[PDB]
Curated annotation (Swiss-Prot):
Residues 6-81 form the RRM domain. It comes from Homo sapiens (Human). Transmembrane segments: none annotated. It is found in: Nucleus; Cytoplasm. This is Heterogeneous nuclear ribonucleoprotein A/B. The modification Phosphoserine is found at residue 18. It comes from the Eukaryota. Identified in a IGF2BP1-dependent mRNP granule complex containing untranslated mRNAs. Interacts with APOBEC1. Ubiquitous. The lineage of its organism: Eukaryota, Metazoa, Chordata, Craniata, Vertebrata. There is a cross-link at residue 67 (Glycyl lysine isopeptide (Lys-Gly) (interchain with G-Cter in SUMO2)). Binds single-stranded RNA. Has a high affinity for G-rich and U-rich regions of hnRNA. Also binds to APOB mRNA transcripts around the RNA editing site.
Length: 81
């Protein structure tokens, strides 16, 4: 594995989605150890994607089993990081 087995990329995030909103959505699939919404270091503006870290890597397969993911009125794109 190139990235941690419990880590996922999450694209298509709405601007009004907070770190807490992100954590609460993925709590449905496993325990979320941590998460982040990536900011542009030059502008401070959101890049519109983030990362989530699960306690148990088994939760990643449960996220990917669900074909469609929706958060704060947007289709979000979870992927193995």
């Amino acid at each position: 594995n190139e990235e941690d087995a419990g880590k996922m990329f999450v694209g298509g995030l709405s601007w009004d989605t907070s770190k807490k909103d992100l954590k609460d959505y993925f709590t449905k699939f496993g325990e979320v150890v941590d998460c982040t919404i990536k900011m542009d270091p030059n502008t401070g503006r959101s890049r519109g994607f983030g990362f989530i870290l699960f306690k148990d890597a088994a939760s990643v397969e449960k996220v990917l089993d669900q074909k469609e993911h929706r958060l704060d009125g947007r289709v979000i794109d979870p992927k193995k990081a």
